[PDB]
Design an enzyme around this catalytic site. Sequence first.
Site, PDB file in Angstrom:
ATOM      1  N   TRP A 105      -9.372   6.269  -0.778  1.00 43.71           N
ATOM      2  CA  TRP A 105      -9.761   6.848  -2.058  1.00 43.71           C
ATOM      3  C   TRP A 105      -8.844   6.284  -3.131  1.00 43.71           C
ATOM      4  O   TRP A 105      -7.842   5.650  -2.820  1.00 43.71           O
ATOM      5  CB  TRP A 105      -9.691   8.371  -2.032  1.00 43.71           C
ATOM      6  CG  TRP A 105      -8.402   8.893  -1.502  1.00 43.71           C
ATOM      7  CD1 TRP A 105      -7.211   8.957  -2.160  1.00 43.71           C
ATOM      8  CD2 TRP A 105      -8.172   9.428  -0.194  1.00 43.71           C
ATOM      9  NE1 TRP A 105      -6.248   9.501  -1.342  1.00 43.71           N
ATOM     10  CE2 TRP A 105      -6.813   9.801  -0.131  1.00 43.71           C
ATOM     11  CE3 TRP A 105      -8.983   9.636   0.926  1.00 43.71           C
ATOM     12  CZ2 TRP A 105      -6.247  10.362   1.010  1.00 43.71           C
ATOM     13  CZ3 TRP A 105      -8.419  10.195   2.058  1.00 43.71           C
ATOM     14  CH2 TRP A 105      -7.065  10.550   2.091  1.00 43.71           C
ATOM     15  N   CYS A 125       0.793  -1.225   0.000  1.00 40.49           N
ATOM     16  CA  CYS A 125       0.000   0.000   0.000  1.00 40.49           C
ATOM     17  C   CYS A 125       0.830   1.282   0.000  1.00 40.49           C
ATOM     18  O   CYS A 125       1.614   1.528   0.915  1.00 40.49           O
ATOM     19  CB  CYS A 125      -0.965   0.012   1.184  1.00 40.49           C
ATOM     20  SG  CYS A 125      -1.884   1.542   1.308  1.00 40.49           S
ATOM     21  N   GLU A 127      -5.020   3.353 -10.765  1.00 42.19           N
ATOM     22  CA  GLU A 127      -5.786   2.134 -10.528  1.00 42.19           C
ATOM     23  C   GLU A 127      -6.910   2.006 -11.542  1.00 42.19           C
ATOM     24  O   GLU A 127      -7.239   0.907 -11.990  1.00 42.19           O
ATOM     25  CB  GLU A 127      -6.360   2.121  -9.116  1.00 42.19           C
ATOM     26  CG  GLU A 127      -5.309   2.011  -8.033  1.00 42.19           C
ATOM     27  CD  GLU A 127      -5.926   1.940  -6.651  1.00 42.19           C
ATOM     28  OE1 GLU A 127      -6.238   0.817  -6.202  1.00 42.19           O
ATOM     29  OE2 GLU A 127      -6.101   3.004  -6.024  1.00 42.19           O
ATOM     30  N   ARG A 175      -0.196   4.513   2.831  1.00 39.77           N
ATOM     31  CA  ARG A 175      -0.095   4.255   4.266  1.00 39.77           C
ATOM     32  C   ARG A 175       0.207   5.456   5.173  1.00 39.77           C
ATOM     33  O   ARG A 175       0.145   5.315   6.391  1.00 39.77           O
ATOM     34  CB  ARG A 175       0.930   3.153   4.534  1.00 39.77           C
ATOM     35  CG  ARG A 175       0.483   1.773   4.098  1.00 39.77           C
ATOM     36  CD  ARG A 175       1.508   0.738   4.508  1.00 39.77           C
ATOM     37  NE  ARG A 175       2.583   0.617   3.528  1.00 39.77           N
ATOM     38  CZ  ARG A 175       3.745   0.024   3.771  1.00 39.77           C
ATOM     39  NH1 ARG A 175       3.990  -0.482   4.973  1.00 39.77           N
ATOM     40  NH2 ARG A 175       4.663  -0.060   2.814  1.00 39.77           N
TER      41      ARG A 175
HETATM   42  C1  HEM Z   1      -6.472   6.442   1.576  1.00 35.87           C
HETATM   43  C2  HEM Z   1      -6.210   6.173   0.289  1.00 35.87           C
HETATM   44  C3  HEM Z   1      -5.492   4.961  -0.184  1.00 35.87           C
HETATM   45  C4  HEM Z   1      -4.797   4.868  -1.348  1.00 35.87           C
HETATM   46  C5  HEM Z   1      -4.628   5.971  -2.362  1.00 35.87           C
HETATM   47  C6  HEM Z   1      -4.268   3.552  -1.433  1.00 35.87           C
HETATM   48  C7  HEM Z   1      -3.505   3.130  -2.524  1.00 35.87           C
HETATM   49  C8  HEM Z   1      -3.281   1.789  -2.731  1.00 35.87           C
HETATM   50  C9  HEM Z   1      -2.962   1.240  -3.990  1.00 35.87           C
HETATM   51  C10 HEM Z   1      -2.799   2.007  -5.278  1.00 35.87           C
HETATM   52  C11 HEM Z   1      -2.814  -0.094  -3.829  1.00 35.87           C
HETATM   53  C12 HEM Z   1      -2.474  -1.083  -4.921  1.00 35.87           C
HETATM   54  C13 HEM Z   1      -3.778  -1.756  -5.374  1.00 35.87           C
HETATM   55  C14 HEM Z   1      -3.658  -2.533  -6.665  1.00 35.87           C
HETATM   56  O1  HEM Z   1      -2.618  -2.483  -7.361  1.00 35.87           O
HETATM   57  O2  HEM Z   1      -4.620  -3.238  -7.054  1.00 35.87           O
HETATM   58  C15 HEM Z   1      -3.054  -0.375  -2.467  1.00 35.87           C
HETATM   59  C16 HEM Z   1      -2.987  -1.645  -1.958  1.00 35.87           C
HETATM   60  C17 HEM Z   1      -3.466  -1.905  -0.692  1.00 35.87           C
HETATM   61  N1  HEM Z   1      -3.967  -1.037   0.201  1.00 35.87           N
HETATM   62 FE1  HEM Z   1      -4.104   0.832   0.070  1.00 35.87          FE
HETATM   63  N2  HEM Z   1      -4.641   2.830  -0.370  1.00 35.87           N
HETATM   64  C18 HEM Z   1      -5.363   3.620   0.454  1.00 35.87           C
HETATM   65  C19 HEM Z   1      -5.962   3.307   1.680  1.00 35.87           C
HETATM   66  C20 HEM Z   1      -5.941   2.053   2.266  1.00 35.87           C
HETATM   67  C21 HEM Z   1      -6.683   1.653   3.388  1.00 35.87           C
HETATM   68  C22 HEM Z   1      -7.640   2.536   4.156  1.00 35.87           C
HETATM   69  C23 HEM Z   1      -6.363   0.321   3.639  1.00 35.87           C
HETATM   70  C24 HEM Z   1      -6.891  -0.530   4.726  1.00 35.87           C
HETATM   71  C25 HEM Z   1      -6.996  -0.102   5.985  1.00 35.87           C
HETATM   72  C26 HEM Z   1      -5.424  -0.075   2.645  1.00 35.87           C
HETATM   73  C27 HEM Z   1      -4.847  -1.314   2.514  1.00 35.87           C
HETATM   74  C28 HEM Z   1      -4.287  -1.746   1.303  1.00 35.87           C
HETATM   75  C29 HEM Z   1      -4.005  -3.167   1.084  1.00 35.87           C
HETATM   76  C30 HEM Z   1      -4.253  -4.285   2.064  1.00 35.87           C
HETATM   77  C31 HEM Z   1      -3.490  -3.270  -0.154  1.00 35.87           C
HETATM   78  C32 HEM Z   1      -3.041  -4.536  -0.843  1.00 35.87           C
HETATM   79  C33 HEM Z   1      -4.224  -5.386  -1.307  1.00 35.87           C
HETATM   80  C34 HEM Z   1      -3.745  -6.589  -2.092  1.00 35.87           C
HETATM   81  O3  HEM Z   1      -2.642  -7.125  -1.845  1.00 35.87           O
HETATM   82  O4  HEM Z   1      -4.462  -7.067  -2.997  1.00 35.87           O
HETATM   83  N3  HEM Z   1      -5.189   1.005   1.839  1.00 35.87           N
HETATM   84  N4  HEM Z   1      -3.348   0.791  -1.787  1.00 35.87           N
HETATM   85  N1  LIG Z   2      -7.219   3.081  -3.554  1.00 35.28           N
HETATM   86  C1  LIG Z   2      -7.157   1.894  -2.894  1.00 35.28           C
HETATM   87  C2  LIG Z   2      -7.330   1.856  -1.516  1.00 35.28           C
HETATM   88  C3  LIG Z   2      -7.265   0.643  -0.843  1.00 35.28           C
HETATM   89  C4  LIG Z   2      -7.040  -0.522  -1.567  1.00 35.28           C
HETATM   90  C5  LIG Z   2      -6.973  -1.752  -0.922  1.00 35.28           C
HETATM   91  C6  LIG Z   2      -6.744  -2.909  -1.657  1.00 35.28           C
HETATM   92  C7  LIG Z   2      -6.578  -2.837  -3.032  1.00 35.28           C
HETATM   93  C8  LIG Z   2      -6.333  -4.095  -3.828  1.00 35.28           C
HETATM   94  C9  LIG Z   2      -7.336  -4.189  -4.968  1.00 35.28           C
HETATM   95  N2  LIG Z   2      -6.843  -5.099  -6.020  1.00 35.28           N
HETATM   96  C10 LIG Z   2      -6.493  -6.419  -5.460  1.00 35.28           C
HETATM   97  C11 LIG Z   2      -6.032  -7.356  -6.576  1.00 35.28           C
HETATM   98  C12 LIG Z   2      -7.218  -7.732  -7.430  1.00 35.28           C
HETATM   99  C13 LIG Z   2      -8.164  -8.629  -6.945  1.00 35.28           C
HETATM  100  C14 LIG Z   2      -9.258  -8.970  -7.733  1.00 35.28           C
HETATM  101  C15 LIG Z   2      -9.416  -8.415  -9.000  1.00 35.28           C
HETATM  102  C16 LIG Z   2      -8.472  -7.515  -9.481  1.00 35.28           C
HETATM  103  F1  LIG Z   2      -8.620  -6.976 -10.705  1.00 35.28           F
HETATM  104  C17 LIG Z   2      -7.374  -7.173  -8.696  1.00 35.28           C
HETATM  105  C18 LIG Z   2      -6.655  -1.607  -3.673  1.00 35.28           C
HETATM  106  C19 LIG Z   2      -6.876  -0.447  -2.944  1.00 35.28           C
HETATM  107  N3  LIG Z   2      -6.936   0.748  -3.577  1.00 35.28           N
HETATM  108 CL   LIG Z   3     -10.154  -1.289  -8.309  1.00 35.86          CL
END
Ligand code: HEM
Ligand SMILES: Nc1ccc2ccc(CCNCCc3cccc(F)c3)cc2n1
Ligand SMILES: [Cl-]
Lengths: 362, 362
Positions: free
Chosen positions: A237, A65, A242, A68
């Site tokens: 957000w 993420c 994405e 963070r």
């Molecule tokens: C506040 C704005 C936030 C932004 C802009 C953001 C941005 C991102 C982005 C761009 C990813 C990559 C997702 C992908 O490639 O599909 C990501 C992954 C992730 N984010 Fe965030 N995030 C945010 C908030 C949060 C919050 C609130 C949580 C949970 C409390 C969180 C937990 C995660 C997790 C667990 C992943 C990895 C999910 C996975 O492995 O599939 N994020 N974040």
């Molecule tokens: N902007 C954010 C905020 C929090 C997030 C938390 C988690 C994620 C992971 C979303 N993608 C997970 C991988 C996946 C799974 C299933 C279908 C897909 F196209 C991609 C994206 C987030 N984006």
């Molecule tokens: Cl998405």
Amino acid sequence: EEKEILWNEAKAFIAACYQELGKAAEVKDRLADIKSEIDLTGSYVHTKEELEHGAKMAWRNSNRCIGRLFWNSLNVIDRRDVRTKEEVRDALFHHIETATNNGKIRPTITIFPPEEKGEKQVEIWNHQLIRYAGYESDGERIGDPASCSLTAACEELGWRGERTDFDLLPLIFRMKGDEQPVWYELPRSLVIEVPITHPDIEAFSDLELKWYGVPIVSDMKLEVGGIHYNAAPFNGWYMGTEIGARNLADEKRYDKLKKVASVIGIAADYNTDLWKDQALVELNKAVLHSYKKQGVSIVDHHTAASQFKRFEEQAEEAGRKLTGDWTWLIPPISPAATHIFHRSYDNSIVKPNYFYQDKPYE
Amino acid sequence: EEKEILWNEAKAFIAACYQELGKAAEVKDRLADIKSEIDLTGSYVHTKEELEHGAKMAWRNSNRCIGRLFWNSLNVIDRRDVRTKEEVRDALFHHIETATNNGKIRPTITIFPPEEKGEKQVEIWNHQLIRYAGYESDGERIGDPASCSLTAACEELGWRGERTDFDLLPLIFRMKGDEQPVWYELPRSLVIEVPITHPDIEAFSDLELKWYGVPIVSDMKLEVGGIHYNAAPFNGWYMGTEIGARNLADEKRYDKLKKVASVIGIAADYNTDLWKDQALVELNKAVLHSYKKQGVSIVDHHTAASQFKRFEEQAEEAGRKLTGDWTWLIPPISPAATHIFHRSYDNSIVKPNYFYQDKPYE
Ligand code: HEM
Ligand SMILES: Nc1ccc2ccc(CCNCCc3cccc(F)c3)cc2n1
Ligand SMILES: [Cl-]
Ligand code: HEM
Ligand SMILES: Nc1ccc2ccc(CCNCCc3cccc(F)c3)cc2n1
Ligand SMILES: C[C@H](O)[C@H](O)[C@H]1CNc2nc(N)[nH]c(=O)c2N1
Ligand SMILES: C[C@H](O)[C@H](O)[C@H]1CNc2nc(N)[nH]c(=O)c2N1
Ligand SMILES: [Cl-]
């Protein structure tokens, strides 16, 4: 034997949690009542404070993420009191409403009852609370291909989509004791969508692109001090990439680049023209512009990276070791223009954290 | 004790090499004469065939290289006969000339005498045979900052650059027995450079950008069957991104993005405008266009990725395990538009291979 595993994760969590909360002296007592609760009952119950902080720690430990920096301002809703599917639905409805906040998105998590003996109390089937359906039969591809299996599963259960490219999937979840999940159509009034337009190119609207305002991931397991909250939907957000660089761009998703190239008036015939790259940039400019114009929160990858650098600095200043997944932290456009690209990260898994869990369908 | 290490690397190499060459029966005999040569002399000498194939294998095993599809057509020049610095210089001059081939670049390696007791026979100081000098004194930054230390080292040895942004560094290398390296100015007639222009934007020429035609990495150690060729300069042709997305774009290199944004007539005030991304694309379009217009070989990252997919397929079809470094294989622009981004690679190190070695200066 499992009381063991639970106890160790518990000890480690309480120590770190109460340390961070300035409640170091309370630890010894808190561990006692925990150890007792484990012996007699097999598990223990988090206080609202512990749970709130635990969810925040979990976000802080999410290697993949980039967002963070704002881990500490996570809005945590404690719905461990739910017992009925009407309550679950209404809680999910409420999460959408309050996270959306008229476009001024609040990073929120709703926490449902944890697993008992590894037995789920509530089992959410959606990947995100708001997601578009996907269909593919003979030759015909419609909607989000990533949603194909869940869509077919919903249609097994009596639901039917209109087969537009943007059918909203219903909420679908299963309560403990029931053999089948239930499904509820989403009130359109709760779901903000953004039509994609371009600041310069009026023709861009001809593509009739749109996306939903709020990504609310609902299929991940929150783990806190040995307790397994398999159902804990969270949201932030969007980072523009994405949507503009993956959801709408991937050939296995909406696959719009050739169409983008056409409306922006460039050829899509030669690799050396870099038309995909140019299309990607205009499409991503369009997404950011559209969200900002509608008043729906969103961040660009550069600003997001700047913020993540602050997160790195903050982690160091606080004496916390930093962990990250380089392959997921770099944005899919212009990654070498961010500092993330030019350093490496330790991909160690630290708990509390959010984890993948097996899909109930497929 | 070192004869041991050499013997094992030798056994492994000959077996694989003669297997690939269809000369399996010759192995047993070849190992004998090798084992004998090791006992008596401490090392052994590769035949021209073994050396040629070994260099090709090394390229094939380069985890970070996207251009590996053409490993088998590597042009190998055997200069193990050199004894004098005049011979080394002339060989280096010749490498430049034949690799360049009037713009129709031939992937070439020139192999100099290997290390004896870990003692270098020839020690090349250049990072590439053709590279621009870099200067930084009080406030003043000139040229390629990556070349700052080598430039200062050359200027210790009596050389002096004109302090343009594109001073060609002299060849600088040290012969065994000499305390200091020697340096030779490059004949301009041997060095092709490409002025950077844009297909649509005439103003792009105002930037007065240019780059050299041929990247000839000369500071890496080729390892083949236990033999250490510390001096073995090799070249391919450029992938456009190397120039347009890194060399000219990195803030710690030529740092041109703000200037690119200006000449292409966009603002560089807001992150959400994605001006860096847009500038990166136009700059990279310019590089490919310019090289193609001059008739100097170059590949775009998409075509390069297509070729690397063929390499993956070829490796499988031939029963060879594939190894790769995902973090280096993805291009720095639009990486998610390539198949590389969407799969993973095993980053194991297989020999023969090319390796980093310590710089003699700094
Ligand atoms: C506040 C704005 C936030 C932004 C802009 C953001 C941005 C991102 C982005 C761009 C990813 C990559 C997702 C992908 O490639 O599909 C990501 C992954 C992730 N984010 Fe965030 N995030 C945010 C908030 C949060 C919050 C609130 C949580 C949970 C409390 C969180 C937990 C995660 C997790 C667990 C992943 C990895 C999910 C996975 O492995 O599939 N994020 N974040
Ligand atoms: N902007 C954010 C905020 C929090 C997030 C938390 C988690 C994620 C992971 C979303 N993608 C997970 C991988 C996946 C799974 C299933 C279908 C897909 F196209 C991609 C994206 C987030 N984006
Ligand atoms: Cl998405
Ligand atoms: C024929 C055209 C070739 C292309 C387009 C190509 C492309 C590339 C690119 C883009 C990189 C990444 C460089 C960087 O990020 O700085 C790379 C790395 C590399 N290539 Fe190639 N390459 C080619 C030929 C060769 C040849 C002929 C060799 C040697 C026989 C070779 C060996 C390597 C090695 C060793 C690396 C990694 C160097 C390091 O780790 O610093 N390549 N290649
Ligand atoms: N097009 C090619 C062909 C062969 C190559 C072989 C090796 C390399 C690596 C060049 N960059 C190495 C890392 C480095 C070292 C020193 C200064 C830098 F800016 C970067 C690039 C290549 N590019
Ligand atoms: C930490 C990271 O591996 C490092 O900065 C890499 C990233 N990927 C790269 N990829 C290429 N092609 N060239 C590079 O110099 C780098 N730098
Ligand atoms: C193999 C590789 O790790 C995988 O395809 C990753 C690459 N990096 C990624 N980065 C993000 N943000 N999202 C993804 O889905 C992926 N996919
Ligand atoms: Cl280079």
